[PDB]
Every structure is written in structure tokens, then in C-alpha cells.
Design an enzyme around this catalytic site. Structure first.
Site, short mmCIF file in Angstrom:
data_model
loop_
_atom_site.label_atom_id
_atom_site.label_comp_id
_atom_site.label_asym_id
_atom_site.label_seq_id
_atom_site.Cartn_x
_atom_site.Cartn_y
_atom_site.Cartn_z
N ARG E 54 45.55 9.88 26.72
CA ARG E 54 45.15 9.99 28.22
C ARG E 54 44.32 8.84 28.35
O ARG E 54 44.30 7.88 29.21
CB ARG E 54 44.52 11.29 28.45
N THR E 55 43.08 8.74 27.79
CA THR E 55 41.81 7.93 28.18
C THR E 55 42.14 6.39 27.96
O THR E 55 41.98 5.86 28.72
CB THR E 55 40.48 8.08 27.37
N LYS E 84 36.56 -6.05 6.64
CA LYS E 84 35.88 -7.01 5.80
C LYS E 84 34.45 -6.65 5.79
O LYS E 84 33.78 -7.42 5.44
CB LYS E 84 36.20 -8.52 6.71
N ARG E 105 35.75 3.55 22.72
CA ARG E 105 35.80 5.02 22.22
C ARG E 105 35.49 5.00 20.77
O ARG E 105 36.04 3.98 20.04
CB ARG E 105 37.03 5.93 22.27
N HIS E 134 31.22 11.78 27.58
CA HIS E 134 32.72 11.24 27.97
C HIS E 134 32.36 11.29 29.44
O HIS E 134 33.27 11.98 30.18
CB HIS E 134 33.54 12.43 27.54
O1 PAL Z 1 39.76 15.68 22.54
C1 PAL Z 1 39.55 16.66 23.56
O2 PAL Z 1 39.70 17.71 23.20
C2 PAL Z 1 38.57 16.28 24.77
C3 PAL Z 1 38.86 14.87 25.20
N1 PAL Z 1 40.24 14.30 25.32
C4 PAL Z 1 40.72 13.16 26.14
O3 PAL Z 1 39.88 12.29 26.29
C5 PAL Z 1 42.25 13.05 26.02
P1 PAL Z 1 42.67 11.48 24.75
O4 PAL Z 1 42.19 11.79 23.43
O5 PAL Z 1 44.14 11.62 24.98
O6 PAL Z 1 42.23 10.17 25.57
C6 PAL Z 1 38.07 13.98 24.21
O7 PAL Z 1 36.85 14.13 23.99
O8 PAL Z 1 38.67 13.07 23.77
#
Ligand code: PAL
Ligand code: UTP
Ligand code: UTP
Ligand code: UTP
Ligand code: UTP
Ligand code: PAL
Ligand code: PAL
Ligand code: MG
Ligand code: ZN
Ligand code: ZN
Lengths: 143, 310, 144, 310, 310
Positions: E54-55, E84, E105, E134
Site C-alpha cells: 500500500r504505502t 558492497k 521505508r 508511520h
Molecule cells: O505492517 C502493518 O501491519 C502496518 C503498516 N502497514 C502498511 O503500511 C501497509 P504496506 O506495508 O503494504 O505499505 C506498516 O507499519 O507497515
């Protein structure tokens, strides 16, 4: 009303259909009559199974005490009840049960299961011949 | 014949008080004067399907001190069960045409019991089956307790650690309960408590037992302090918070112990007993191990000889 | 014995009556059920029979029986009366009760209901999985 | 709207002869007259859960030639389906709130059809689902057969190799069977034969087909020789005898070939086509791959743009 | 410049109630009136060092809806950091000479804050840093809560599941606590409780919160039921008892629910939400995911475009 055979009466609701499968009772050419969710004076609702010219194995009657403790077994000959008893609970049950201990050797190897049975209060206890663990027949009969 | 001749030794539950006293009396005698040829012309299988140091080596040494020969394996990976898919049943079926007795350890509860169904007239000795039973451990334990305490009744016994998966304490609690007036103290994490079936047995015989959250609560009271290892190889992943020893015995915790108190441990220890305990007069886990020789010799002599005179 | 209201499935061939109970989960109810197995018929010789009180079957539900008991008769009963008689006709699809035999079909791993297209093939009945599109004889497609 | 507007493109078996011709007619046009902005302001997901070179890169290239943007993944391992246990259904449920169309390839049969049940009004285009369907391969294939034969009716078509697991030939055979008077030769090891649902379909339409054990039999009469790769990643271990191409086409096998005949292959090839074939005028697998751009442009146009292109 | 122009977006704890409302107000506008070219000539890095569906896909989709280009990776294994031995600092030091913003991320807490110290004038947007923050999840969440409740003040909010490791609820609780009169119910296994720094913060603002052992207690009074996944990839082996969802919401649990109440979940779910919930009018997790587009568009707009959108 049959002439000769067996009538399993006072089977608890939703159990009647199980006994049919478990004992492969319908795997016969013999006339069979079954009533499910029948009104019961002493039970409210009950299941009922009639089999002509047919009698249970001791194997089948032994297992019946676990499945349906309050059930009655009637033996009919010449349009008349001849034997009527609550099935006598044994102390060993072979083959039909599965030990709920996943690390029991009985799962991997060519042996018949076997349990020692005892206790009142509520549930009855089954002790595995192999792992020696003891369980409530609730946990075991959830095979 | 003696009561143990040609008998399977699977579970303490099948042995009487007299049976245990017989092994202990026989062990005492063999320690006093050895019978190096007692099992001459015997060939014994030592089949270990999981790891062992003390149990397999003391068993095999005991066989040799009595003059028997030994065949077997300490790993299943090169048997036909390990590479060709052979069942345990068939394995026992063929080995029992070769040997005069089978010593077996196996990761599954029940494996020794099952073996007796395929071994015909060949006696099976359970060196451990999963987390179930460990009868020869209990034989040596009782012998050691007898030695240090002068008795097997009216003792105050503390068992500490992983009581749920410790096949050592399942067998040992059952054995001690065949004697009179013993009192038990169970010091374990909740997730690894002593199983209910053992507790029920204690209740039926009217034996006192209680739960304690620390060793110090009972230190002044105990004749035997029996430490155990967390059985990590048997834990469900859900029980991984218990991997570390919850109770750690150190030399300093012994200041209020009874003088005659002995610290036992079937071994191996990880961290539950600090090395500074080894030099105290209470440490006795190595002498206990040492006694595996006399208890296992005794058991072997009684199972394979109709009677002996000593 | 006779019911006041519900469905009577007559003329079920022998050894089928029990399968129908198992497959369509007919016994999963508090309603009074009456079953006769291995009854004489004359039209069939031997037959099974299932009566279910206060319970009714749509044409489609009746059709699902065509796979197992094509010559069956379904009697709708109200007020101790046969108010309707119908016979199973082969359906276009069968959903939920069967399990696709292709191990690599997405239907096993995911939260969807099974579904097969039904067609007459030679003297057999062929089932085409909605998802994987592979086709099988009805004999080899299991239940659950 | 054109017949294919907002349509899912899952299986050739769901499409008609008219739909296929529509794609082809649109492909002709855009090749002659590119419309670089036809899909401006579209964002399209490219979701590949198993490997791809041609299908994914040509689809993405098609999207850019028409002005659409592209998001997605070529590997499921870093999706939340790959690492956090998410279902395919939930994956499609969220992605379908982002984009205007979903192109997907997946190792399980039926995956594209499933996505269709969770994607709402977002069209799903099947880039291949296990060994089932590969409809966009068939579109480019038809375009190629048309380009080189001048027609799609009354052709002699051999398909060689793994027919059981070839999603390519499942789709293509169904498509050609929608046209008149085509003839089929199937050249496969028995273990990887064309499935019965394809053959039944042909019999129903009275289409002629036969099995053959060599290429050489039919070389004289074929217009299209469609070679395939053994689908080893789909094979059951019991079918491992067929991993090696059973039929190897070389340049010398082409002596008796009609001047018009083309050798096609959806690619990649292993050894079923020797490299010496590459230089002969019958080789057309690379030209075929290139036609993927025109077929996939056309398809995107028709699905995402309501008006017939011209 | 608007308050958020060229700002790093690392932690909700760094933002004010006004900043959040600004994002939401911009999201409303662009949803009503898309500005497909607002970020034309921007190139933006999408750098995901752990998994995402999603993110990452919604962020990239947002970038394309606004006309920006996108570069990056969804997997660190083929970066020079992956093969590397390169530091994260050096990675950010070079990337920040390429692009106009960095979305990242990372599996370690603090990573986004670190990048900020090497990125010069290039803004960093935290798509999640270990179990810490987040912030863009919280932005979409707030948008969703606003959309369905008509307000962000005076709400009853339950958060269920893994609160210790949920970066989602760390950010969201801090955000709601910036608004007036909200009430919190925390439903977690003790081992995965809401951290003390969140609770202290609430106590400081005099916000009401309490712990509960079931969903059913609070079902009657909640406006937002925020379900979470157990963060198994963050768990210590000692916490492995909590891998399985301790609380499973099913459609029947929703009998006593207020008509206005929505069930939210940042997704992916495992079993903490049974599929039967999907069809009930309380289910809003998919609508929530879709709101990610509007929240993330708005954020990019405000960070990369100096003027307030209108
Ligand atoms: O992983 C979760 O349960 C909550 C949260 N989920 C999301 O952001 C959705 P995704 O990982 O598909 O981008 C996260 O902290 O990564
Ligand atoms: O000739 C007979 C007699 C009896 N039965 C069948 O045997 C079953 C039991 O026979 P009974 O009907 O005689 O038992 P009961 O109710 O009088 O007393 P309880 O057992 O309930 O305490 C009845 O359900 C009847 O259907 C026959 O099938 N044929
Ligand atoms: O063959 C059949 C079919 C049906 N029934 C149906 O079973 C119901 C009960 O028939 P019962 O004969 O068992 O009445 P009961 O008072 O003895 O019940 P209990 O207290 O012993 O439990 C009756 O209402 C009848 O309709 C049969 O008894 N036998
Ligand atoms: O409720 C019941 C119980 C039993 N039976 C039993 O069914 C058997 C036949 O009873 P039928 O009523 O079905 O006779 P039939 O001539 O109509 O049979 P078909 O040609 O239609 O096949 C008989 O054995 C009867 O006792 C019922 O019909 N209904
Ligand atoms: O009130 C009723 C009426 C009918 N029935 C049951 O309906 C079933 C059929 O009722 P029918 O009376 O229609 O059987 P039929 O023999 O006359 O016609 P066919 O279908 O055999 O060709 C019979 O088995 C009967 O037991 C009831 O159970 N209750
Ligand atoms: O392993 C333990 O901790 C206790 C006990 N230990 C032993 O028997 C000693 P060993 O494994 O060295 O033979 C056992 O049950 O195996
Ligand atoms: O893999 C094959 O042999 C045929 C076919 N090949 C292709 O689509 C080419 P690619 O896998 O590079 O996209 C397929 O089914 O995937
Ligand atoms: Mg009665
Ligand atoms: Zn067992
Ligand atoms: Zn299928």
C-alpha cells in the site's frame, strides 16, 4: 417398527448423523429408518436409528458409550424388544481415536491407537497407551 | 527367576517399590564387587535417535564392564530409517533378530513402548522417549539419594526448572511416590509446570506437594535439591519466553541449607547451576552421573540373568 | 411417516441417500428429518427417501441433485398436501460443495468459493473449474 | 463504447472472433499512426508474481508509448503478500483503489479470474496465470500470423513441445479455432500432450487435428511452425523425463519448408531452436516478440479508451 | 511559503494540529480538483528497504497523478548498500544529489531521522522506520476518520492488537491527542502494550484512556475500531506467544455497534479481521487504503510546491 434388528434410541441431537458415518451403518442392503430432531419426553430432542436384521459389533457398542452415553440400544426379535440396555463403557478403545499429543509416536507408525478410559465428575479421561498422556474425551473426540 | 528377568523397562509406572529396591540393592553389590563376565556372550543394541552423552556412554560402558558386546548408532541419519524411509517398527523388527536386548532413546513419546510390540522376546530399555519417561535416570537418581541420605522415605525434595518437559522428573516423582511420607516442592515457571497427571497421582496417594516461586523459600527445608535444564528442543514456539533458566542456583544461595542437603541435576546444565556451586559440599551432580554405571549395570544384569548371587 | 409441511425427496437410488445428506449438509438443522434407506419401490426396486420438515428447495437446489439422483422426485408439501412435484434437471454450475482437483488452482489458497461449469460429455459429466479452467469428470472431483 | 471498453481480459475462451479482429485492427492503426497521449493521466499497475522479460517489458513499454504512468513490482517478495502473509484478494482489493487497470502474471491458474472478483470497476489483464491462459501472447501471435500469412483462415499450424503446460498454445489454439478451416498438428511427448478440453472443443467445431512424432512429417505442409519451451517450473517430479527438448529444430530441418512458412516461438527458447535457425528466412520469433508492442498498445487502448481509435 | 514547504516529515510528534489540518484541507481540494501537473519536472526517490504494498504503490501513484517522475528500489539487495557494504548515510548522501524529495521505508527505528542529517536541502518523507513512526499512515487515517465521523474531536477510539510494535498507532495516537476530548481504549496482550511514552503524553494532556481485555466491552461506545496486525518481523523470540491474533473481529461481534462506527485497519490483515466483516457497512479498511492517494498527494504538494493549493 421393525421385526428383527437394532434400535438405537435416545441419541442426542446432531449425533445421529455422525454414528451413521462412523459405523458405516448405511453401507448395507438392510432396510434402515432414521429420525433426526425427534421430540423426546426425557430429552426434548433426540435422534433415532433403526436397522433390520442387523446387530452392532461389540466394537461398535463400546465406542457408542463415548459418543452417546445416554443412548439406549434395543435388540428386537419377532416384533418384540428382547434386549434393552445402556451401552456398557469399556476401558480400552482401539483404532478409532487419535492422540492429541502431536509428538506421540502413534502418528508416524503402523500401529492401532489405544486408550485407557476412566473418571466421572464431568469429562472422562483417555490415557494414550504410547505417550502415557491423559486427555479429556472432549479434546480427543475433537479428533 | 528374579522379578526383572526378560522384562521391558519402559516407564516407572510399571515398576513396583520392590522392583526399584532390587535394582538399588543389586547396584550396591556390583559397586562393591564387580562381575566382569556376567554378560559374556551377550550382544546389546544401543540405538540413540536423539543426542546423548551420559545415558549412551554410561550404558555402553556398563555393558563392557559386564563383558557384553555393543552394536548400534548414536545418530539415525545413516540408518535405513534415515535414508531409505524405513519405519521404526521394521527397524525394531530386524534388530531384534540380532541382539539380546535393546537400549533406545527417541525424540517421540511412546517410541520405546511401540518397540516392545515388534521386538518379540527381546527386552527393550527406555533411555528416554520424548518428554515422557526416563526410567534409568530415575534408577541412578534413587541410588544417589539413597547413598547420600540413607533413605528414600520422609524426604523433602525440591524439583526446579522445566518440570513440564523433564522426563527425568516425571519418572523420578512417580518413583519417590512409591515410598512413604516424601514431601515435594515444585519450583517452575507456570508455562513449564509439573503436569496435572503427576499431581493427581500425588493427590491419590495423599502425598504433600506445594508450589514455590523461589528456591530460597525452601532452601532450609530440603534434603534433595533437584535442578533441571530447560528442554528447548521440545518447547513449542509459544513457550520461547522460557528458554532462559528462570532459577539460577549460586554458591551464596546455600548459606541456610541443611548440611546433608545434596544438589542433583540429571545434566547437562546450561546456566541454572553456576560453576561456583561445583566446589561446595552440596554439589553432587557429577557423583550422580558417576552412579549411572552401577544402576545401569544392575538393570542389565537383572534383565539378562535369571538370577545372580552377590 | 407423513409430514405436514416441507420437502420429500423420493426415488433416490440406493446408496445415494446418505451421500446427499453428507454433501448438501441436510442434517445441519433443528428441523425434523425422516430417512428411509433400502426401501422397496417396484418403479426402482430399491430406493432411499428423505423427508425434511418446514424446509424448501429452489429449482436450482433441486437441480444440484441431478449429478447424483437424476431420476429423483422432489415433492413440496404444505398442509399435508403435495402442492408441487419436480424432477432434477442438469444444472449449469455447481458451487461451494466441490473441491477442484488441480493442486495448482488459486481456489485452494484464497478466500473464494469453488465453482464448476457443468456439461454432458459422452456418457459422463464434465466439470470445468471457473478459476483454473481445467476440466475433469465429475467422478474425480471430490467434495468439501 | 467499443466492445472491449472496461473489459477484463482473462481467457481467449471468453472472447469472440470479432474481439480478436478488433485488437488486430487497432494494432495496425497505432503502428501506422502512434497516438503518444491516448492514455495520458492513466496510471496502470504492472504486477508480476513470477518471472518475465518480454511480457512485462513490452507491456510497460506500450503503456509509455501511449502516455500512461506505471506502478507495480516484478517480484512478489517485497510486497506485503510476500513478507506479511497477505492474501491475493486483499492485494487486489487495495491496488484497485489506486490505478486504472491491472496487468498481472501469477504462478497459480485462475489468479487473474480471482483478481476480477475483487477489483471492482478496474479491468484486469491476464499476463499469464500458471499453465492456463496467456491471452496477450495469443493477440501478438495472431498479429504475427496475420502479418506473415496474409490471413488467419485455412492455415496449417503445427505446435511443438510442451502442450500440456503451455498457456501459450491453450490460448492460441482456442483463438485459431474461432476462424475457418484451420488445421492442427500436435507434436508433443505423450506426457505433455494437448489437454482434452482443447481437443473436445476442436471436435465440436469439426476442426481437423492429428498427433505426430516428428517435425519432418509435417514440415512440407505447415504455414506456421509454433515451437514451445518445456515448462519445467510447472512439471510434476513424475514428468522430469521431459525436461529436455524432445524436438530440436535446426536449419537443415527446413529444407522441405514452404517459402511462406514462419517459425514462431513465444520465447524464451532453450535448445528447441538451434541458433543456426536465427539467420534463415523462416525465423520470425524476434519479429514476433516485437509485435508484442503493437498488440499490447491496441489492447490497452481498447480497454482504457471508450472510443474506437482511428 | 506554506508551513510544510521543504519540510522533513519524520514523526507526528514533530507536527502540530495545524500541520495535520493543512494536509487534510489540501487532500480535500485535490480530490475535488486534480492538478495533474503540479509536480511536473520533479523527480522523487522511492526507497523501500523493507516490504510494502500500500504505502509504496500509493505514494508512487500519487507522484504520477501530480506529474512527477519516480526513481528508487523496493528491495535493498541490489543497491550498493545491499552488495558492497555501503552505509545508509552514504546512500542518502548520493541520492540527495539526484532528486527533489526522498520517500523512505526502513527496518531500523530512526532511519528517516538519520537520512535527514545527510540529505542537505532534500526533504525526507518517512514511509515507516522500524516500529517507531508511520506519519503518512496517520495522515490517511485522520482523513478517513474525518470522512466517516465528520470530525476529529470528541471521539471514542479503540486500538486493538500489537500496540508495542505498531508504528501506525504510535503515530495515530499522538495525532489524535492533538485534538480535543478524544477517548482511548487499548486492547492488547500485555506483552505488546502501548509504550509508556505514549501513555505519559496522554496523561500530560489529561486525555482519558483505559486498558481492556476484549472488544465486546467497548463495542457499544466506539466510533473508530482500529485493528492492527501482530508485527511478527519485529518480535523478540521471547514474545513468540503473541504471533497469533489474540483478538479476531467477526461480523457477529458487530451487533451492538453504533451505526456511525467504522472498522479501520492499516493492513495487511492476517486473521484479526475475518472476511465476513468485509461485506458489513462497518468495514472501511479498503476505503481507508484508497484515501492513501489523497493524503499522500496532499503531502507531496505541500512539501514540493511553495504555494498553498486551492
Ligand atoms: O505492517 C502493518 O501491519 C502496518 C503498516 N502497514 C502498511 O503500511 C501497509 P504496506 O506495508 O503494504 O505499505 C506498516 O507499519 O507497515
Ligand atoms: O416391535 C418393536 C418395538 C419397539 N421398537 C422400537 O424400539 C424402541 C424402544 O422400544 P420401546 O418403545 O418399547 O421403549 P419405551 O419407549 O417403552 O421405553 P424407553 O426405552 O423410552 O425407556 C422404540 O423407539 C421403537 O421405535 C420397534 O422398532 N419395534
Ligand atoms: O420410527 C419412528 C419414527 C418416528 N418416531 C417419533 O419419535 C417420537 C418419539 O417416540 P417415542 O416412542 O420415543 O416417545 P417417548 O415418550 O418414548 O420418548 P422418550 O421419552 O422415550 O424419549 C414420536 O413423536 C414419533 O413421532 C418414532 O418413535 N419411531
Ligand atoms: O414415510 C414413509 C416411510 C416408508 N415408506 C415406504 O416406502 C416404500 C414404498 O412406498 P411408496 O408410497 O413410495 O410406494 P410407491 O409405489 O409409490 O413406490 P414408487 O413406485 O413410487 O417408487 C414402502 O416400504 C413404504 O413403507 C414411505 O413411502 N414413506
Ligand atoms: O402429507 C404428506 C404427503 C405426502 N408425503 C410424502 O410424499 C411422498 C410422495 O407423495 P405422493 O403421494 O405424491 O407419492 P406418489 O406415490 O402418489 O407419487 P410418486 O412421487 O411416487 O410418483 C410420499 O413419500 C409421502 O410419504 C408426506 O410425507 N406427507
Ligand atoms: O536432557 C536433559 O536435560 C535431561 C536428561 N539428560 C540426560 O539423560 C543426560 P544425556 O542427554 O547426556 O544422556 C534427558 O532427559 O535427556
Ligand atoms: O514461458 C514460456 O515458455 C512461454 C511464455 N513466455 C513469455 O510470455 C515470454 P516472458 O516470460 O519473457 O514474458 C509464458 O507462458 O510465460
Ligand atoms: Mg421411550
Ligand atoms: Zn499418544
Ligand atoms: Zn481449479
Amino acid at each position: 417398527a421393525i421385526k428383527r434388528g437394532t434400535v438405537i434410541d435416545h441419541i442426542p441431537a446432531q449425533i445421529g448423523f455422525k454414528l451413521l458415518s462412523l459405523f458405516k451403518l448405511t453401507e448395507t442392503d438392510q432396510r434402515i429408518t432414521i429420525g433426526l430432531n425427534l421430540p423426546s419426553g426425557e430429552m426434548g430432542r433426540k435422534d433415532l436409528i433403526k436397522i433390520e436384521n442387523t446387530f452392532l459389533s461389540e466394537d461398535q457398542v463400546d465406542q457408542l458409550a463415548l459418543y452417546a452415553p445416554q443412548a439406549t440400544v434395543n435388540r428386537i426379535d419377532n416384533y418384540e424388544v428382547v434386549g434393552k440396555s445402556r451401552p456398557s463403557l469399556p476401558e480400552r478403545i482401539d483404532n478409532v481415536l487419535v492422540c492429541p499429543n502431536s509428538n506421540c509416536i502413534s502418528h508416524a507408525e503402523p500401529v492401532s491407537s489405544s486408550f485407557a478410559v476412566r473418571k466421572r465428575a464431568n469429562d472422562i479421561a483417555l490415557k494414550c497407551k504410547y505417550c502415557e498422556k491423559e486427555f479429556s474425551h472432549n479434546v480427543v473426540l475433537a479428533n | 527367576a528374579n522379578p526383572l528377568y526378560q522384562k521391558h523397562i519402559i516407564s516407572i509406572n510399571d515398576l513396583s517399590r520392590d522392583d526399584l529396591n532390587l535394582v538399588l540393592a543389586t547396584a550396591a553389590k556390583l559397586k562393591a564387587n564387580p562381575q566382569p563376565e556376567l554378560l559374556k556372550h551377550k550382544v546389546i543394541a544401543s540405538c540413540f535417535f536423539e543426542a546423548s552423552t551420559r545415558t549412551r556412554l554410561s550404558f555402553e560402558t556398563s555393558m563392557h564392564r559386564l563383558g557384553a558386546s555393543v552394536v548400534g548408532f548414536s545418530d539415525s541419519a545413516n540408518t535405513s530409517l534415515g535414508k531409505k524411509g524405513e519405519t521404526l517398527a521394521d527397524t525394531i523388527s530386524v534388530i531384534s533378530t540380532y541382539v539380546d536386548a535393546i537400549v533406545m532413546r527417541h525424540p517421540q513419546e511412546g517410541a520405546a513402548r511401540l518397540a516392545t510390540e515388534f521386538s518379540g522376546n527381546v527386552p527393550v530399555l527406555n533411555a528416554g522417549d520424548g518428554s515422557n519417561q526416563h526410567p534409568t535416570q530415575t534408577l541412578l537418581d534413587l541410588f544417589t539419594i539413597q547413598e547420600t541420605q540413607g533413605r528414600l522415605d520422609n524426604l523433602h525434595v525440591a524439583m526446579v526448572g522445566d518440570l513440564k518437559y523433564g522426563r527425568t522428573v516425571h519418572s523420578l516423582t512417580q518413583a519417590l511416590a512409591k515410598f512413604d511420607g516424601n514431601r515435594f516442592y515444585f519450583i517452575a515457571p507456570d508455562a513449564l509446570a509439573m503436569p496435572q497427571y503427576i499431581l493427581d497421582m500425588l493427590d491419590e496417594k495423599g502425598i504433600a506437594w506445594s508450589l514455590h516461586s523461589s528456591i530460597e523459600e525452601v532452601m532450609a527445608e530440603v534434603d534433595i535439591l533437584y535442578m533441571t535444564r530447560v528442554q528447548k528442543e521440545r518447547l513449542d514456539p509459544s513457550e520461547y519466553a522460557n528458554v532462559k533458566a528462570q532459577f539460577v542456583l549460586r554458591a551464596s544461595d546455600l548459606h541456610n541449607a541443611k548440611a546433608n542437603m545434596k544438589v542433583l541435576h540429571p545434566l547437562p546444565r546450561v546456566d541454572e547451576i553456576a560453576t561456583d556451586v561445583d566446589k561446595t559440599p552440596h554439589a553432587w551432580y557429577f557423583q550422580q552421573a558417576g552412579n549411572g554405571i552401577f544402576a545401569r549395570q544392575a538393570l542389565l544384569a537383572l534383565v539378562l540373568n535369571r538370577d545372580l548371587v552377590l
